[PDB]
Amino acid sequence: PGIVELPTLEDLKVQEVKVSSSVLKAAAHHYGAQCDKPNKEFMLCRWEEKDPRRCLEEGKLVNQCALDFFRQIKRHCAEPFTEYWTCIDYSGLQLFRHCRKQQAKFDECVLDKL
Amino acid sequence: MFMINILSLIIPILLAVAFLTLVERKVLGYMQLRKGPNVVGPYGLLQPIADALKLFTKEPLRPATSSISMFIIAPILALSLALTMWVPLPMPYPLINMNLGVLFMLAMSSLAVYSILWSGWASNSKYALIGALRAVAQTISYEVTLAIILLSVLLMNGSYTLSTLITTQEHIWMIFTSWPLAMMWFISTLAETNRAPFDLTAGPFAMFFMAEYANIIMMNAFTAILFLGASHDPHTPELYTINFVLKTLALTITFLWIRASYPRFRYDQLMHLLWKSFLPLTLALCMWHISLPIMTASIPPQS
Amino acid sequence: MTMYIAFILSTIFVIGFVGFSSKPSPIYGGLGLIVSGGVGCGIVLNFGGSFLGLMVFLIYLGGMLVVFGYTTAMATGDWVIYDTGDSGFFSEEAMGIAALYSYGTWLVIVTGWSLLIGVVVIMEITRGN
Amino acid sequence: MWFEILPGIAVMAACLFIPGMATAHIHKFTNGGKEKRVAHFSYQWNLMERDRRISGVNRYHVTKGLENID
Amino acid sequence: MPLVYMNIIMAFAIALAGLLMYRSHLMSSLLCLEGMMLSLFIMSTLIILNTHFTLANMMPIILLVFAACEAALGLSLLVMVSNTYGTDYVQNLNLLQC
Amino acid sequence: PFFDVQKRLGLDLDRWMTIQSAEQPHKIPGRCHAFEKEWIECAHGIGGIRAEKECKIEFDDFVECLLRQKTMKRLSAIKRQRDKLIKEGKYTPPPHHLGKEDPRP
Amino acid sequence: AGRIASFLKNAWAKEPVLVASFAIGGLAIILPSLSPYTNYAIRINRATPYNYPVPLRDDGNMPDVPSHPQDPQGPSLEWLKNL
Amino acid sequence: MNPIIYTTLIMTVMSGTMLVMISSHWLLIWIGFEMNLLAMIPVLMKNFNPRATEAATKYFLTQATASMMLMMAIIINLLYSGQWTITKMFNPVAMTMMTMALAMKLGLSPFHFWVPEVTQGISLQAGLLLLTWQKLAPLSVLCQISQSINPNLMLTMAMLSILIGGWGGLNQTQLRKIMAYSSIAHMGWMTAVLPYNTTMTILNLLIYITMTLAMFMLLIHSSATTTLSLSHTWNKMPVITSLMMVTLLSMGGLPPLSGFMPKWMIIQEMTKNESIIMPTLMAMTALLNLYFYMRLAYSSSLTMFPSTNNMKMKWQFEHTKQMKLLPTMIVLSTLVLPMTPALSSLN
Amino acid sequence: MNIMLTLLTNVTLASLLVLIAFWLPQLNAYSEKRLPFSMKFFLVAITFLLFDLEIALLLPLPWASQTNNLKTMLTMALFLLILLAASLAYEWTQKGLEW
Amino acid sequence: LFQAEKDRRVLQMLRENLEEEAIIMKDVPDWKVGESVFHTTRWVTPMMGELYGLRTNEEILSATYGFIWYT
């Protein structure tokens, strides 16, 4: 009874965010602070449409915004961020609590730069 | 390299329980103004080896009328459970990380009575059957209060994860938060393994013996992790391992001390002890430890 | 795909049930029921029910079958119907079980009353006279 | 004297030392020089799966930094 | 309805048939009843977990508790019968007849 | 027979546990929440006979979600035809289904 | 009053375990309704976010709903920090 | 046992029945059945002796098997539809399993074998409770799901119960087994109208409960459990025998007694549904129940059996305890036929 | 997988070592030459079973402390423990814990 | 971001399954490519066997039991 419609494989092509979980956890707070508007647009559309096929453009937008965020991080605060996510990757639970020092370094670096 | 990890867990436990028998005769001997074995080996160090060799070479006295099936199954189950109890424990990292590790240990301890039941039933003797029934009743009676005390203590941990016990005791031991529960837990672990003052009862005998001493050391490790938490540094777990092993050794020496210090109870006396002194206090302290985190707004995080 | 591990466990479960359903030598029937209970616990654990499987393995095996053996001693296709998403940062089974104290007040009341009545009934029956 | 009990206690201590140290060393060896990642609650399991799919060598512990974002 | 549910239902049917046979040994009757409740526990748990119905995670616990209480009651009755006759044989319960 | 004490007193003794779509803890949804919600809204206030005769579409969809008999039948037919073709030798799986693909986050 | 005091003094002798058990149980029953931190525990349980906070569709009639997390609108957790 | 414990157990039995009657969740109905079973055993075993223990273990086995079957039916219903509410059963197999479990609980044929022996083993008070109160919960559950029952199976077991009760009551000299077979026949009458009208089922249940209460209270008053022991009742208390004879005539369905009401209304309702053969067979079979009621009346009141010398002492003493509502139950089981149209109250 | 392998290794090692223990001294040649049914133990076992059931009821407590309905869960847990204590007290006062 | 990636991955797997299904079932007489088993047109979350049905056994076993067996 009916045909299930699916978007073509071309519609699902987008420049992926190729960073691991530790980098994402290290940058998560500033990522949520900066990239809030596209993320909230996407999630509102997601709980309103109740259909993944209706929310592809917002997903591409949030990918683009995350890419811009990480490009700014690479441009300005590369090495403090590298040390911070090195911490976060070492721990088995990926706990924020263990090297608050590197977190402070990254925070002051981003506060001074951006 | 998982098999290597499993073997490096199993073999040292057997060596430890093999040398635990030598340490028990030495500590007791010195508490009795004498020495332990100090002839076989430089300081009795070969005594454990000699005993093992003699036992494995002595004739086994099969009853010639008993059921061979349960007779051979009972030591297998006993030793298998004794070795399995070791896997969940975090020293600092567990071989197998379980969400409900404490519950798993409770279940294994619950199974541990089937070896007693089957050995008593297959012995083909009424008196041995009476002794086995008596031991089984004592064991289940005390595992009741073990479970209640364990859940009361874990109410301050937030889950059944054993690794979380290290985080809970990062600044202070659990002994200071609840010492009466620790006292009753220690006495219940005495009663579980049939150790004095609760010891009311060649190959297979050796197997059964190994299982009992492995259970003793495992109880000591679980108690040390539960109530005397060591500080763990993620970049140097050797410190945590050393502290944990030292505390376990101290607690085992404490059992040997207690064996050397006291007479033994009667059966009705230990049943009355449990059912009329430990259970009411355990229930009252369980109510208290349910109410305390809510009263003090100190509920642990994990859910 | 491990040749339908769930299927193998189910067949072992059924074989154990046929084993103790023949009712030979009630101690051996109890052993067969112990094996069947262990296999069922394995089925539940492999399905994803860690706490409920552990409840089986602890309560059922270590209390009820132990009491059964004590009393006897006194005398003479898969992987397809599964889900797609995740659960969050908790296990839904634990949340549903813990909801017994916030949602199941009526259930707790009736179960506690039944347990107390069972204690009283056992006492009255075993008085004898 | 009482210190003649010490050799046996030391043997016991080394035997009990072996398991924990061995487990920690194997965990560091098989997890790329870091602690073994723990996965309860099914979300950090998804994190591990995404890490494995992102690494390109089918290993989660191979961490992809900001150098891989181009 | 896949094959695992069919296997568990077959186990329940086998346990019920074994209960209804009565070769002897009322203890075996209690064992068959407990096998039936174990099968019920397993199959209900599978149904509840498969459909993600969160609130029925209670029900297997309640079933287990009630069935174990019934098991204790049956064990007490069996003990009383054995103390009356010296054995738990089924054929000794022939005093009352249709 | 049935004495509706709960509806008389508004007690809600056991109604919270009757259906999948009724206030699960932490807002965890059932696997077939939408289908059962649609079926319940279809049949409300109509009566059992009329609900059975007229809301059959919603109940059929709900049962299909619950047991997935049709979906498993279709998948089994597809896999059987694929097996027949690969045994005969006119079809070859793509690298996507042979494990040679490029995974995505 | 004298009978109750005599009963308590006689129970504290030859039955200290039961007296301690009843005292601890009664205190555990009574104290939670009198402590002021139980509301703090409830509030802490309220503030633990297990789910994603789904945004609301803005229609210009929600001055109390913040447009950004940094906005002053919305619940605060400074009380939890001060604890 | 202690009177406090007995009162608590009776209240627990009644509360389990009420929990079955008032709940809308299948698990709660199962819990109510379990609670009732748990609290029922000591009541049956109140007077400790081997016969009571044997009756109690038979009853426990039967009820535990029935409860397991009921739980299995609930689980299958949940499997084929994610529903816990007691409504349409939603599955043919689940319905069959549930019907057999409820028949086993009620004692309908072919699951009738336990009722006579359990009744014979227990005392008269436990028999009264078992034959009156222990029918409310299963019948209420059957009424709630009456639209799901397959009429063929229900009617088959109903007719079987009527035939079995009629035939098995003919062979009995013990009064308790006679009452058990009468209960089986009345259950068969009650369940033959569930597919068509539940109000008739409830009316029959009320009438039978009143009649059974009257009969058991009369039997307790004149402490006889055998036909010959009851044959001595005329020499001390002839009024009790006359009332018992009137009650027995009522229980046989003879108009214008109260017992004619349920059979009359059930026949009329079944005829409204174009069913003719089954009511005729049912009345023909109830003739057997009437026959053994008449035999009991002949042995009890219509003739005078020989007595013994030691009755002269019994002539000098009066009953210390008088049972309240015995007079009301006799009148209600004898003279309520003119009030028949009151059944519209959905009793 | 890992737990299955660990249990298999434990069982295999135990079986191998027990069998070698039972067969090593079997190669050399040598000579090769009731009723009581105490009721109290059964009551102990039944009491253990009932208390174990009530403990099983008490087991989900660590997760029940995060419900936002703290008063209701506290009341229900205290109710369960109070009935557990009541069962113990009833069996105490009815001479059910004597020898 | 995880939600967006999950949606894209699921849609891609469904599209690949549809393509291989269209290729495979070309000669079946009464078959229809991409036909739903539901009367409603609402989007339905696919099962585990719908996405990995035509894939190899190792990743089927992974996606099914990896979290359960990970210790």
Ligand SMILES: CCCCCCCCCCCCCCCCC[C@@H](O)O[C@H](CO[C@H](O)CCCCCCCCCCCCCCC)COP(=O)(O)OCC[N+](C)(C)C
């Ligand atoms: C009205 C007639 C009263 C007299 C007749 C009583 C009949 C027998 C007694 C049993 C009935 C007791 C009524 C309890 C019904 C349970 C529901 C009610 O209590 O509300 C609950 C509130 O719980 C109450 O605190 C329960 C207190 C009562 C239990 C304590 C004593 C129970 C004793 C009753 C008899 C048991 C044996 C006898 C013991 C002496 C619900 O809490 P709430 O949070 O809003 O909603 C939960 C849903 N959420 C999660 C979505 C929010």
Ligand SMILES: CCCCCCCC/C=C\CCCCCCCC(=O)O[C@H](COC(=O)CCCCCCC/C=C/CCCCCCCC)COP(=O)(O)OCCN
């Ligand atoms: C209101 C709180 C309720 C919840 C708290 C309770 C939790 C757990 C405690 C209950 C466990 C079960 C109690 C069982 C009671 C048994 C009573 C009994 O029979 O004991 C008497 C003996 O003890 C008694 O006399 C009965 C009880 C005596 C009174 C106990 C204390 C009463 C209240 C004291 C505390 C009051 C409040 C504390 C305030 C302190 C200030 C901070 C018989 O003992 P035998 O074994 O026969 O040995 C005698 C032979 N030598």
